[PDB]
Swiss-Prot record, chain A:
Organism of origin: Homo sapiens (Human)
Protein name: Eukaryotic translation initiation factor 3 subunit E
The keyword Cytoplasm is assigned to this record: yes
Signal peptide coordinates: none
Described function: Component of the eukaryotic translation initiation factor 3 (eIF-3) complex, which is required for several steps in the initiation of protein synthesis. The eIF-3 complex associates with the 40S ribosome and facilitates the recruitment of eIF-1, eIF-1A, eIF-2:GTP:methionyl-tRNAi and eIF-5 to form the 43S pre-initiation complex (43S PIC). The eIF-3 complex stimulates mRNA recruitment to the 43S PIC and scanning of the mRNA for AUG recognition.
GO CC, any one term: membrane
Curated annotation (Swiss-Prot), chain C:
Protein keywords: Acetylation, Cytoplasm, Initiation factor, Phosphoprotein, Protein biosynthesis
Protein name: Eukaryotic translation initiation factor 3 subunit L
One GO process term, biological-process aspect: formation of cytoplasmic translation initiation complex
GO CC annotation: cytosol; eukaryotic 43S preinitiation complex; eukaryotic 48S preinitiation complex; eukaryotic translation initiation factor 3 complex; fibrillar center; membrane; nucleoplasm; synapse
Organism: Homo sapiens (Human)
């Protein structure tokens, strides 16, 4: 990877406006926590994904974070400080902060439709200038961004504000928990990272991580947007060689849509590059739940693999995100590791298939009835023993070399007979 | 690589991209660059990675430059090293003896690492099925030690390789260990690392797993039922290794082989050794169709 | 203009050449012996039986597309231009067969095929491989319209292989060669899907590139996809009633569409039932003797919900392809598992490579003949 | 075939680039030589057919087919006789 020479001296020194913190001393499910925090560096005060830490277990420590983000949904952050009933008594700032915003919004809501009804390229941009100010004063006000960044988008600060207000609008619509106006800013982020900038990695790997955040929580077709989140930027999945490869769960939604939403042919491209080499190896050293997906599969295990999937599948479902590819990756971990066993093998006891993958034998029997009908396992089924015989071994492969030495050489010598 | 873990050293070579900066920046730093990728291959060998011991010795051991990459080549060593005054420049410059390194280790790094690789690889080739015969390889570094009918006891560093190579070709893992481990303690080559006990133990299994393959590659036509209980006891290899062996013996080598891992049984039935000559003629006549096509490719 | 006058320029030349061979092929062996002796090229007066007939196959339905109902030209074609060539004494060379190939060329365009019991019976002249390719081309459609595709699968493999050894060398086809290559591709892809798993006969004529493509189509039409049958019909729908080519696609006449609808409505009513037939047989007969629970294992797979599970399976047993049986005392569905063989495709090409030696030995000694 | 490739590495694979060097220079200067025009088209080492190796190549590979036709028939006459004389 080429931009690593910029990373070779910098080594993961990102630049965000909401800086660090994630929800001190914890009890349960700890591999998600730094994972949540290193993205909460880069994802600008989520808005439910603070309380996504809280859905596994309640803490009083979700309070000190979004209290100090009074731009975003002012009154609900007034409610969170009293949700712990804390005398923080300086909450007299957000009503001071909103009052300048109301004088800037409604003082220019007059101008907001002078921007539209005139469409005067000064007076639009004159309104847009004070709303370049105001949508960076508050972009939360994301509907005030949504009216703003639907017309001629480019504010009089086309690079710093028009990113951080549109990434702000990508944040703040998701911070208002909108997704279609975030699908506006899906496109407005994925092109702004594509222009891009000066493209320092401290900007770029942040902007690469900015791609990861909205695509992490699936609402709409991120099973198509997995290809947007793999096959962009020289398709490293973590986008950060940058030894803390912390765009971390991306393999799971990637190998979701391979096995679920695609076929698995085309999972060989996943196992070779997107599992092994450097970045996912780092995330193999980060989450053991993704590890038993891959490391017992790369051992081609048949009993330890299927159950340590199934044990980690009980923790794959513990991905308490807005997820929408949760049991897809879980079920098609079973369905592909059975495809892993019966790929090359000789037989299986249906009673063993029942007891290994914890099903009943008729469920085990009728599943190869489906696996012939899907033509994923081409075999026969012994109807009465409960022993699917799968004996694919070929004899005399000669006829194919023979076919292509006499369809070519016999028929290209035909062509030399016209002179 | 040395003072930390070599996963970083693999990355930072890929990171800083020092394939190009070394040229303009004082090619005695290319000597330090060639010192570095040697020490990459050292910590390829310290981490036991045999391919990277071959591939970090790619800018080094694809050439006889490695003598002069410590600045110690001789003038009449070839018809190239001229002259004494430039030899005075290079050897007033290079190099201190503690900055010299063991090239006999480096050859035993370079030869043995592909010895456990290329011999099951060529045992696929020498089973009357070859299409990937790679020229200019350890195969050719074997050729200088190969055609030696007089060769008695292994005493030289290549002789310990070539003896262990024949022990590797027999499929017996134990016989390689006599030829390598004791003799690199005899030549103090094993006696160089503190990690060398692990490096030996890493290369214990690289001999055990791969001579198991040459056991299967050479005795392939008549093996039509292959155990997994016996081979777990024979080559002293546990089942999750053996399942990682035998599946990759079936999947990656693409041998026609039925497998019942609940029964722990490999069933192969290759069929046939007289039709290996039919494969040997399809080695010949497929070349017949290609240059016939290439007869028209150049001419048109 | 530039078409319709040249249509009439061709047809008047055609119906005249329908007359010159109707008169001088019955009692005369006089102009025939004049035609054997003084012109040494045997080609040209056997070209005219194919050159003037193939473009007559064009120009007749060219007017019949406009003259849809109450149409002239097929009566001008068959009864006066083709049947005058059909029922005569033979020009004892490659004319007398190709007059029947002129007739069966429009007796295939007319969908009225029954006389294929007759067209090969009066064809007791030597079946030259020039005519043998056009024999198994035309005759195999009647087997394709016989709904016995296990016999039709072998006929279309012959004409698609093109190792049926034709070599002429005076533009004899004429001017249209890969259309025959592409139509028999679609006619054998029609026969590839319809019977599989039993062929295993898609290997010689259809090469491995189209074995993968149409074979993946062969899976999907049997696994359920109607897009393959839509590909199988719409690529083949002019290929049952093509003139060679229509006139000119326009918006203003309703005329051209009216035999275009006649090409659509005929051959969709046949093969769509065969598309359902390919779905009924589609499942592999995994085991010969099913118990009732594994009968209900396949009654599930035949058609469930719910009602009419046994009787729908009874409909799906009785499609000539499920020879089966209920043991009503035992509760033992006793059926077939018909399977086939592969390896024997080295006995045909053992002489073809003995030809591929000899065919290489032939022309290069013919080059050696021109440099002797 | 290594003869057949190397000759076609010289018959045309040289002359594809030999004329490419020659046609580029507008095939000569009017007032002067035509210096490189004389220099270009230097003939390659096989220019034509290599028909000394090729003739006994045509012999000895035909001699291989005699050994084939030996190995073909000697195969048959036992594959007859074993299928013959076992079959009772």
């Amino acid at each position: 990877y080429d931009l690593t020479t910029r990373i070779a001296h910098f080594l993961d020194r990102h630049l965000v406006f909401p800086l660090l913190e994630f929800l001190s001393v914890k009890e349960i499910y700890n591999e998600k926590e730094l994972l949540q925090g290193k993205l909460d560096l880069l994802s600008d005060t989520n808005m439910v994904d603070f309380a996504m830490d809280v859905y596994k277990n309640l803490y009083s420590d979700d309070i000190p974070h979004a209290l100090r983000e009074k731009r975003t949904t002012v009154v609900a952050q007034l409610k969170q400080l009293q949700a712990e009933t804390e005398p923080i008594v300086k909450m007299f700032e957000d009503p001071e902060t909103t009052r300048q915003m109301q004088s800037t919004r409604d003082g220019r809501m007059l101008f907001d439709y002078l921007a539209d009804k005139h469409g005067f390229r000064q007076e639009y941009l004159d309104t847009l200038y004070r709303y370049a100010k105001f949508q960076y004063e508050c972009g939360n006000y994301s509907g005030a961004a949504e009216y703003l960044y639907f017309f001629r988008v480019l504010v009089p600060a086309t690079d710093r504000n028009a990113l951080s207000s549109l990434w702000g609008k990508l944040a703040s619509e998701i911070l208002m928990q909108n997704w279609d106006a975030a699908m506006e800013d899906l496109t407005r982020l994925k092109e702004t990272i594509d222009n891009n900038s000066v493209s320092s990695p401290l900007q770029s790997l942040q902007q690469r991580t900015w791609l990861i955040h909205w695509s992490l929580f699936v609402f709409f077709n991120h099973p198509k947007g997995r290809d947007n989140i793999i096959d962009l930027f020289l398709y490293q999945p973590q986008y950060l060689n940058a030894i803390q490869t912390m765009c971390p769960h991306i393999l799971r939604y990637l190998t979701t849509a391979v096995i679920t939403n695609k076929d698995v042919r085309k999972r060989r491209q996943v196992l070779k590059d997107l599992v092994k080499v450097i970045q996912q190896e780092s995330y193999t050293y980060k989450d053991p739940i993704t590890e038993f997906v891959e490391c017992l599969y790369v051992n081609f295990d048949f009993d330890g693999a299927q159950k340590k999937l199934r044990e980690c599948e009980s923790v794959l479902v513990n991905d308490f995100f807005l997820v929408a590819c949760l049991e897809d990756f879980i079920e098609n971990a079973r369905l592909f590791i059975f495809e892993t066993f019966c790929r090359i093998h000789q037989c299986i006891s249906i009673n063993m298939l029942a007891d290994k993958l914890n099903m009943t034998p008729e469920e085990a029997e009728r599943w190869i009835v489906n696996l012939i009908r899907n033509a994923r396992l081409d075999a026969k089924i012994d109807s009465k023993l409960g022993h699917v015989v799968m004996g694919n071994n070929a004899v005399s492969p000669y006829q194919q070399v023979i076919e292509k030495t006499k369809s070519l050489s016999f028929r290209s010598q035909m062509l030399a007979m016209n002179i | 690589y040395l003072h930390s873990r070599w996963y970083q050293a693999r990355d930072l070579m890929l990171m800083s991209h020092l394939q190009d900066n070394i040229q303009h920046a004082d090619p005695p730093v290319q000597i330090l660059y060639n010192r570095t990728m040697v020490q990459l291959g050292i910590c390829a060998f310290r981490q036991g990675l045999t391919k990277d011991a071959h591939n970090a010795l790619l800018d080094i051991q694809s050439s006889g430059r490695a003598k002069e990459l410590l600045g110690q080549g001789l003038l009449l060593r070839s018809l190239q090293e001229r002259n004494q005054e430039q030899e005075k420049v290079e050897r007033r410059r290079q190099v201190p003896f503690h900055l010299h390194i063991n090239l006999e280790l480096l050859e035993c790094v370079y030869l043995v690492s592909a010895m456990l690789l290329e011999i099951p690889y060529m045992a696929a080739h020498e089973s009357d099925a070859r299409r990937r015969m790679i020229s200019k390889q350890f195969h050719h570094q074997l050729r200088v030690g190969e055609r030696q009918p007089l060769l008695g006891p292994p005493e030289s560093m290549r002789e310990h390789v070539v003896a262990a190579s024949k022990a590797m070709k027999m499929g017996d893992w134990k016989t390689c260990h006599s030829f390598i481990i004791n003799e690199k303690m005899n030549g103090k080559v094993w006696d160089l690392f503190p990690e060398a006990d692990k490096v030996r133990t890493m290369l214990v299994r690289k001999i055990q797993e791969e001579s198991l393959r040459t056991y299967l590659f050479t005795y392939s036509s008549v093996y039509d039922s292959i155990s997994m209980e016996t081979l777990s006891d024979m080559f002293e290899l546990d089942l999750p290794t053996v399942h990682s062996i035998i599946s990759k013996m079936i999947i990656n080598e693409e041998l026609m082989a039925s497998l019942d891992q609940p029964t722990q049984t490999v069933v192969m039935h290759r069929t046939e050794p007289t039709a290996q000559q039919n494969l040997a003629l399809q080695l010949a006549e497929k070349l017949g169709s290609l240059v016939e096509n290439n007869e028209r490719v150049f001419d048109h | 203009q530039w078409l319709w006058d040249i249509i009439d320029e061709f047809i008047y030349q055609f119906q005249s050449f329908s007359q010159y061979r109707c008169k001088t092929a019955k009692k005369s062996e006089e102009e025939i012996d004049f035609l054997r002796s003084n012109p040494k090229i045997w080609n040209v007066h056997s070209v005219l039986n194919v050159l003037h007939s193939l473009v007559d196959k064009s120009n007749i339905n060219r007017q019949l597309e406009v003259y849809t109902s109450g149409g002239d030209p097929e009566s001008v074609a068959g009864e006066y231009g083709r049947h005058s060539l059909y029922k005569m004494l033979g020009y004892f060379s490659l004319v007398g067969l190709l007059r029947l190939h002129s007739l069966l060329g429009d007796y295939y365009q007319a969908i009225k095929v029954l006389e294929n019991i007759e067209l090969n019976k009066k064809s007791m002249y030597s079946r030259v491989p020039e005519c043998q390719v056009t024999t198994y081309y035309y005759v195999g459609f009647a087997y394709l319209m016989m709904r016995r595709y296990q016999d039709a699968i072998r006929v279309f493999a012959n004409i698609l292989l093109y190792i049926q050894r034709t070599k002429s060398m005076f533009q004899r086809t004429t001017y249209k060669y890969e259309m025959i290559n592409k139509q028999n591709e679609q006619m054998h892809a029609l026969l590839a899907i319809a019977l599989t798993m039993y062929p295993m006969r898609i290997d010689e004529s259809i090469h491995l590139q189209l074995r993968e493509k149409y074979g993946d189509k062969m899976l999907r039409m049997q696994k359920g996809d109607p897009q393959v049958y839509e590909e199988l019909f719409s690529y083949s729908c002019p290929k049952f009633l093509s003139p060679v080519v229509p006139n000119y696609d326009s918006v203003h006449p309703n005329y051209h569409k009216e035999p275009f609808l006649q090409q659509l409505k005929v051959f969709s009513d046949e093969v769509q039932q065969q598309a359902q037939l390919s779905t009924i047989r589609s499942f592999l007969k995994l085991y010969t003797t099913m118990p009732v629970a594994k009968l209900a294992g396949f009654l599930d797979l035949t058609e469930q919900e719910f009602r009419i599970q046994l009787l729908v399976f009874k409909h799906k047993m009785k499609n000539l392809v499920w020879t089966s049986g209920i043991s009503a005392l035992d509760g033992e569905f006793q059926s077939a598992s018909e399977v086939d063989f592969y390896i024997d495709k080295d006995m045909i090409h053992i002489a073809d490579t003995k030809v591929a030696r000899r065919y290489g030995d032939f022309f290069i000694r013919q080059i050696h003949k021109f440099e002797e | 075939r290594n003869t057949s490739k190397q000759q076609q590495q010289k018959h045309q694979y040289q002359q594809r680039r030999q004329q490419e060097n020659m046609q580029r220079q507008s095939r000569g200067e009017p007032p002067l030589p035509e210096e490189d025009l004389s220099k270009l088209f230097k003939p390659p080492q096989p220019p034509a057919r290599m028909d000394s190796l090729l003739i006994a190549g045509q012999i000895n590979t035909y001699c291989q087919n005699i050994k084939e036709f030996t190995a073909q028939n000697l195969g048959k006459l036992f594959m007859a006789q074993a299928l013959q004389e076992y079959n009772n």
